[PDB]
Design a protein around this ligand. Structure first.
Ligand SMILES: NC(=O)c1ccc[n+]([C@@H]2O[C@H](COP(=O)([O-])OP(=O)(O)OC[C@H]3O[C@@H](n4cnc5c(N)ncnc54)[C@H](OP(=O)(O)O)[C@@H]3O)[C@@H](O)[C@H]2O)c1
Ligand SMILES: NC(=O)c1ccc[n+]([C@@H]2O[C@H](COP(=O)([O-])OP(=O)(O)OC[C@H]3O[C@@H](n4cnc5c(N)ncnc54)[C@H](OP(=O)(O)O)[C@@H]3O)[C@@H](O)[C@H]2O)c1
Ligand SMILES: NC(=O)c1ccc[n+]([C@@H]2O[C@H](COP(=O)([O-])OP(=O)(O)OC[C@H]3O[C@@H](n4cnc5c(N)ncnc54)[C@H](OP(=O)(O)O)[C@@H]3O)[C@@H](O)[C@H]2O)c1
Ligand SMILES: NC(=O)c1ccc[n+]([C@@H]2O[C@H](COP(=O)([O-])OP(=O)(O)OC[C@H]3O[C@@H](n4cnc5c(N)ncnc54)[C@H](OP(=O)(O)O)[C@@H]3O)[C@@H](O)[C@H]2O)c1
Ligand SMILES: Nc1nnc(-c2cnccc2N)s1
Ligand SMILES: Nc1nnc(-c2cnccc2N)s1
Ligand SMILES: Nc1nnc(-c2cnccc2N)s1
Ligand SMILES: Nc1nnc(-c2cnccc2N)s1
Lengths: 246, 250, 247, 249
């Protein structure tokens, strides 16, 4: 009966909003988490109270390593084990921090390129091997006007655009659509406060950040039957921010 | 009180599906048309049968000329006259035909039609829409293939490129007024009536997702999303609806 | 047997630097101008001092109208008449002023902003090609995806020009005519107060200064040269990294 | 007095053409190579016979691993040790082969296709900058990144990452006077493995002359970007593809 979705990094913020909204649309969900065990379970409790046995949790470090492929295949497996099917993959988990050109660098590589790009590629491979099917990749609207000193992160997000397009092309014959949603500033990451207002003030549309829910709305669209011919598309949800010159 | 939308070139094909779906969502519609008088009238009948007083037609040439600004002002005015408001503008009307660089209309007529309909009229309508002013938005019909154009279609491609610029420029400028501006970019959808049948399968063969063109309804679905409350933070975005066609190398 | 080049809006600033550098490279040049007769003639005289009979001027308004096609045809024609050939077209002339969405009529703004930036380039390109290392270089704009506010028509003209660059490269490649662009960010500034000039210079990562006209010309020279023989449909940003800078 | 450049994968084909052209322009060159030992030395001989002490070779695997940072640091050191300076870095070395989504393990493919095409360029860029006049980096990109070969996701990911590196590094290193740009071939010298018929299929798609670019034509664009005629250009990627990327399916 009901379709099932994997949302990586689903315990908090945008991944949570995505998981909730998919659930409210009648998806069963695998809430993937790495460090946020208590939040992941709490979200699962909340969803299962609403409808029994519709939410499970799955722990995995999505850092690149010789065990990343096994971890990714296990995430896809948990969805089939729990629900008998996997209809939707949302690649939301993301590491984000500066790596100035002027943690070891190879750990930074592992987290920024691994979680942002290599895990999505491995998840994509496993999702496809095990088959309205679609993947949604959480991209970044500021990819071409990147944050200063954030090269590895930026590289990881560009790689994700490449994956989005390559996977859309290759998996289209399987009926698997592949798309993305690119936030501008949503709920800031902990991060600065005078710093956060500086950003909201740049945004043409209402001088504010998205909510997580506004991100989720775009995901919900792309997975829906209203996006059945859309693949290879990346929808910016940034209130115009990427259009604003320096 | 129901919202209202203007859809240009709405008598047939994609514009029609857009009009229908906006109406089904609860909009009152101004059906703009140029030559397709019967179909336009026919569609307004259908819509008004379903909910009386929810559909009018509006005839206008969208070729560029020194009266285009008045025609565009009039198209917007008509929505306000019939419905007391104008919440949504869809720029869908479009001329499309070859203009070879090395080669029965003059080149000034080709410029006026291809650039007027695809870019100048959208700019003038946008300006009238904004001036006359809730979830206000504009959706422009763009082209997923503008960076991999049809050979010998330079004026058309220039017009569609300009429409991308308009989408971004108007998104940026109208945002502080609460008007969002976005686009939907078809690949191949319902193919020209004048086009033969082997040429159609040639093009359908190219589409990775399902080896066919978009239904008009699939295009309309994307319009519906962009005007909806689920797209409130979305402005300056152009959604390709092309089944992966723009991803395919030569 | 020297090649020959048309540069539009060649009398001053960037088109002047382009015509000079093309002339230095061995081109004979048609210096097109609209209002700047004295500077156009003065450039032609300088250039002709350097080498007899290698520069002519050509006056024309590039605003769109029913006479634009004939104007563009005559510009191309003048190069064949003066020099017997036309190897290079540089589409440089450009109007630029705001057209807010919310004292010329709108249709005159359209004529000027879409005419000069896009329609005249298309008409010139058609004339250039009908009359045939042949290439065209269009002056595009590095900031076309992050436009100046209230410049919709200018921005529309420059997007149109990108489409032309691509469409003409595709269509003219069988005839061996390459078509490329050069996209300045901030170059010689629009007169303006040094405080406001400085605001823009401040934004440029590479050296915190605007491009010299010669720096723009350098990229044009490359694209027309034998070193760019396989390059077509390409637009080279010459912007010191300005378009990479977020808001 | 003479400037010096590092060129990766410089033993054959486009990297060779690039090192040859930089050499003809008066650069001293470090010819980096991985397996092409004989070709690398043969090339350095040739160059050194034209002017002596102007070419060294440097062997290194650019696969990602915990020792890639050291190898990249050493490549840059090669150039300072041989020539006392490092003016230009050309990131040319590149692994290229299919990785279908539906021999090598997947982690080896990630390591070779992402390492050579993106991680090594990032590490080399970091060491080039740390060790520091017309300083620049040129990355060999791919004009077809947005219309990719089917079943080449990992290669395509690496080339996209290399576009982000190009932009991120142009931005970050501009204050230090280091420019970062790219050159994007369409089809150039086709793989040695490729059959003639398959080659002509690709040649036929190219609007400008229905042929692939010569290695020299690719090199010309690199030569421009490092030149004083590109002094204000940074963050630009120049397609050298004869119009291939403009052709619809
Ligand atoms: N926030 C914004 O404004 C913004 C802007 C642009 C793009 N985005 C994109 O939108 C998406 C979600 O946004 P967000 O801010 O909600 O994400 P986020 O808070 O930065 O991180 C999302 C989750 O990813 C997981 N994660 C991080 N590193 C991991 C690793 N090594 N292994 C496994 N899991 C890991 C974490 O899960 P655990 O907590 O369970 O460990 C984390 O809570 C991301 O892909 C992001 O790149 C967001
Ligand atoms: N069809 C595709 O595969 C495809 C692909 C890419 C983009 N698009 C875009 O999607 C939109 C709709 O596609 P479509 O195929 O439905 O369009 P279409 O049928 O080619 O044209 C839509 C309408 O535009 C109107 N129009 C044409 N010239 C006009 C003028 N001078 N003044 C006023 N109206 C004029 C016509 O109205 P009358 O019939 O009333 O005279 C026509 O019915 C267009 O913007 C198009 O550029 C379509
Ligand atoms: N300067 C910059 O920072 C910058 C930035 C981005 C792009 N660009 C582009 O680079 C190119 C050259 O830049 P620029 O600053 O030197 O240009 P500009 O000084 O603004 O204009 C160039 C010339 O175009 C001619 N022109 C203007 N309107 C005309 C009309 N209606 N008919 C015929 N000719 C007309 C003028 O000729 P007369 O003087 O003879 O009347 C003018 O001297 C342009 O395409 C521009 O859009 C420049
Ligand atoms: N050829 C084309 O049509 C084309 C098309 C698009 C883009 N490009 C780009 O243009 C550049 C040059 O192309 P090309 O065809 O000359 O390149 P290529 O022959 O495929 O590769 C150049 C060199 O890369 C080195 N390399 C491969 N794997 C390596 C590793 N694990 N560690 C260190 N070095 C390694 C090899 O050096 P050894 O032989 O010494 O082992 C090889 O000779 C590349 O970046 C390519 O991606 C080329
Ligand atoms: N995982 C994240 N990706 N991007 C983030 C972010 C947070 N604040 C500003 C910009 C950002 N990209 S957080
Ligand atoms: N108005 C129109 N714009 N584009 C059209 C079209 C039809 N078939 C293939 C491609 C197209 N752009 S019809
Ligand atoms: N013709 C012109 N096009 N762009 C110009 C310009 C001048 N100052 C700042 C930005 C600009 N685009 S002038
Ligand atoms: N290292 C390489 N990158 N791309 C290559 C290539 C070879 N043939 C066709 C397209 C290609 N990108 S070889």
């Amino acid at each position: 009966e009901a379709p099932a979705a994997v949302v990586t990094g689903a315990a908090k913020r945008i991944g949570r909003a995505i998981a909730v909204k998919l659930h409210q649309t009648g998806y069963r969900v695998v809430i993937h988490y790495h460090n946020s065990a208590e939040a992941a379970v709490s979200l699962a409790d909340e969803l299962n109270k609403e409808r029994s046995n519709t939410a499970v949790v799955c722990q995995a470090d999505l850092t690149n390593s010789n065990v990343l492929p096994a971890s990714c295949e296990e995430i896809i497996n948990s969805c089939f084990r729990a629900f008998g099917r996997c209809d939707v993959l949302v690649n939301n988990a993301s590491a984000f921090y500066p790596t100035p050109l002027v943690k070891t660098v190879e750990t930074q590589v592992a987290e920024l390129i691994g979680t942002n790009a290599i895990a999505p590629f491995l998840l994509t491979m496993s999702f496809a091997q095990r088959q309205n099917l679609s993947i949604v990749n959480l991209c970044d609207a500021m990819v071409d006007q990147p944050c200063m000193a954030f090269s590895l992160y930026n590289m990881g997000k560009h790689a994700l655009v490449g994956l989005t397009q390559s996977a859309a092309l290759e998996l289209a014959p399987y009926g698997i659509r592949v798309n993305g949603v690119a936030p501008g500033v949503s709920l800031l990451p902990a991060m600065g406060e005078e710093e956060k207002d500086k950003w909201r003030r740049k945004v043409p549309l209402g001088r504010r950040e998205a909510s997580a829910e506004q991100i989720a709305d775009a995901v919900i669209f792309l997975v829906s039957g209203s996006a059945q011919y859309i693949t290879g598309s990346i929808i910016k949800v940034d209130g115009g921010l990427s259009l604003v010159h320096a």
